[PDB]
Design a protein around this ligand. Structure first.
Ligand SMILES: Nc1nc(Nc2ccc3c(c2)CC[C@@H](N2CCCC2)CC3)nn1-c1cc2c(nn1)-c1ccccc1CCC2
Length: 287
């Protein structure tokens, strides 16, 4: 049972963007808070598109996953609005918005440690889900939200959260799934109901690619037919210049689901990259 928030206690402000079958708005919620004090809080209002109301059950059940879990890297739910004929979730408003937009705007000022920190934080969230045997199913840079920017005055890192997964791929049309290549793994295009924990390891690889590519969208130049063919031909994404991160991307985007690495191993690989290696590559041989 979601906490029910009266529409009279919600003010809908600017559009903040859109997801699959959804639109998001910035809102203000009026509530009685701790100590009976009336407060106003910024909120995210996520509205299921009128043209997609048949997915309402999957829309709410996906958000309920994050009501049952509490973790510092997971977006908070506040409740649902009794907004008449509208299916509307009231969630935490993350100040700096989605990571894909942020990476694109700030691609000049983001260094490798920033990227490693964000990737390690996402891997920490995903290890928590893995340990709970829960499948997200929609890991992408758009669904990663930036709580706080890096503070170069102190060395403090950025801080991210992962959003709820939205409507499950298990109910989505094939045409939608094809457009979601290469986030949706190859085995889930024809049979999305076969998704498993290995699904999220593939998508994590794609998301790490996004992080390393300044918010480019992989394979955006390929139409749906050519995206399908990319999987038929067993291609990998183009390597970022950071070779060790290219290796991790590709290890996660293994066409064999059972060979994709655990999130514990992913975290280990990321952690190792924080320590500089000043020995020239290939020094085991003398010329
Ligand atoms: N929680 C949650 N806060 C937020 N803040 C947010 C979103 C957009 C902006 C801002 C904040 C302000 C910053 C602005 N910049 C621009 C440059 C300077 C300032 C950018 C605008 N966005 N956001 C969320 C976002 C999504 C899903 N969920 N939440 C989502 C999850 C699953 C399925 C579908 C969706 C819907 C779309 C993605």
């Amino acid at each position: 049972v979601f906490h029910k928030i009266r529409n009279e206690d919600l003010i809908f402000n600017e559009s903040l963007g859109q997801g699959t079958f959804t639109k998001i708005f910035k809102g203000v919620r009026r509530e009685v808070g701790d100590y009976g004090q009336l407060h106003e809080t910024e909120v995210l209002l996520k509205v299921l598109d009128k043209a997609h109301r048949n997915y309402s059950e999957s829309f709410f059940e996906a958000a309920s996953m994050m009501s049952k879990l509490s973790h510092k890297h997971l977006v908070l739910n506040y409740g649902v609005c009794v907004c008449g004929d509208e299916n509307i979730l009231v969630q935490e408003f993350v100040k700096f918005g989605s990571l894909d937009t942020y990476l694109k705007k700030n691609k000049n000022c983001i260094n490798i440690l920033w990227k490693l920190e964000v990737a390690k934080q996402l891997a920490a969230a995903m290890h928590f889900l893995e340990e709970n045997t829960l499948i997200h199913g929609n890991v992408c840079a758009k669904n990663i939200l930036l709580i706080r920017e890096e503070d170069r005055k102190t060395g403090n890192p950025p801080f991210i959260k992962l959003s709820d997964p939205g409507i499950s791929i298990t109910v989505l049309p094939k045409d939608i799934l094809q457009e979601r290549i290469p986030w949706v793994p190859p085995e889930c295009i024809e049979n999305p109901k076969n998704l498993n924990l290995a699904t999220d390891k593939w998508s994590f690889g794609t998301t790490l690619w996004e992080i390393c590519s300044g918010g480019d969208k992989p394979l955006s130049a390929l139409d749906s037919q050519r995206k399908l063919q990319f999987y038929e031909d067993r291609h990998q994404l183009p390597a970022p210049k950071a070779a060790e991160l290219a290796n991790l991307i590709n290890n996660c985007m293994d066409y064999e689901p059972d060979h994709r690495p655990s999130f514990r191993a992913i975290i280990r690989d990321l952690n190792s990259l924080f320590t500089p290696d000043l020995v020239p590559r290939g020094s085991h041989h003398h010329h």
